[PDB]
């Protein structure tokens, strides 16, 4: 997946889309390539337990410090548990093993914290297998989230702008400072061009993505 996207990002900013004579960003909008999934909230308790997050369908997951993953569906009952090696198991909070009690109460603490404290990102967007967080890392300016459907998301701590990269649709979704969302084909921002702010963040996404590629 990521090699698919690095190539796409490499064409687009090889095209230097900001230096066009007439930039027509709006013609690169493609309402039909809106992502089905993105991360709407997150809690980093990785020094103690790991990374808690909410998906835009109100499901929540945890990537534990041991690289296990536990997902709660939006039905509040169905769980998916992924071991380090990727082995997948279906459980419920009703009928569940007792070896997972600690991780399930930790997940319940993450979901309760996110419900009380946080703002759901992109809540005005009306968006497929359920994805889990494959890997993540922070910098001083952004957090980088990579989902198991190939999508990469970057949340900037500065202005709360957000990027969502989908390799399958060859599309980037940009949420700007006033929370308006626009989805674009990467090959149509090749042609028409783009803003400097979004070119600046596409440049930065190329770095984050060859970091992700180097983590394998």
């Amino acid at each position: 997946h990521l090699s698919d996207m690095l190539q796409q990002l490499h064409s687009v900013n090889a095209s230097k889309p900001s230096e066009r004579g007439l930039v027509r960003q709006e013609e690169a909008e493609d309402p039909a390539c809106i992502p089905i999934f993105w991360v709407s909230k997150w809690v980093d308790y990785s020094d103690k337990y790991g990374l808690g997050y909410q998906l835009c369908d109100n499901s929540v997951g945890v990537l534990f410090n041991d690289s296990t993953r536990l997902i709660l569906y939006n039905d509040g009952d169905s769980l998916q548990y992924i071991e380090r090696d990727g082995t997948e198991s279906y459980l419920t909070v009703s009928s569940h093993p007792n070896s997972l009690m600690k991780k399930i109460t930790l997940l319940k603490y993450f979901r309760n914290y996110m419900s009380e404290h946080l703002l759901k990102a992109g809540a005005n967007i009306t968006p497929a297998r359920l994805p889990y967080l494959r890997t993540w890392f922070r910098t001083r300016s952004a957090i980088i989230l990579h989902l198991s459907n190939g999508s990469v998301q970057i949340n900037f701590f500065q202005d709360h702008t957000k990027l969502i990269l989908c390799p399958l649709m060859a599309a980037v979704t940009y949420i700007d400072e006033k929370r308006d969302f626009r989805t674009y084909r990467l090959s149509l921002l090749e042609e028409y061009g783009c803003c400097k702010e979004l070119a600046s963040r596409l440049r930065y996404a190329r770095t984050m993505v060859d970091k992700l590629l180097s983590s394998r």
Partner: peptide
Amino acid sequence: PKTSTPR
């Protein structure tokens, strides 16, 4: 920031 954007 230890969490995403609070409300």
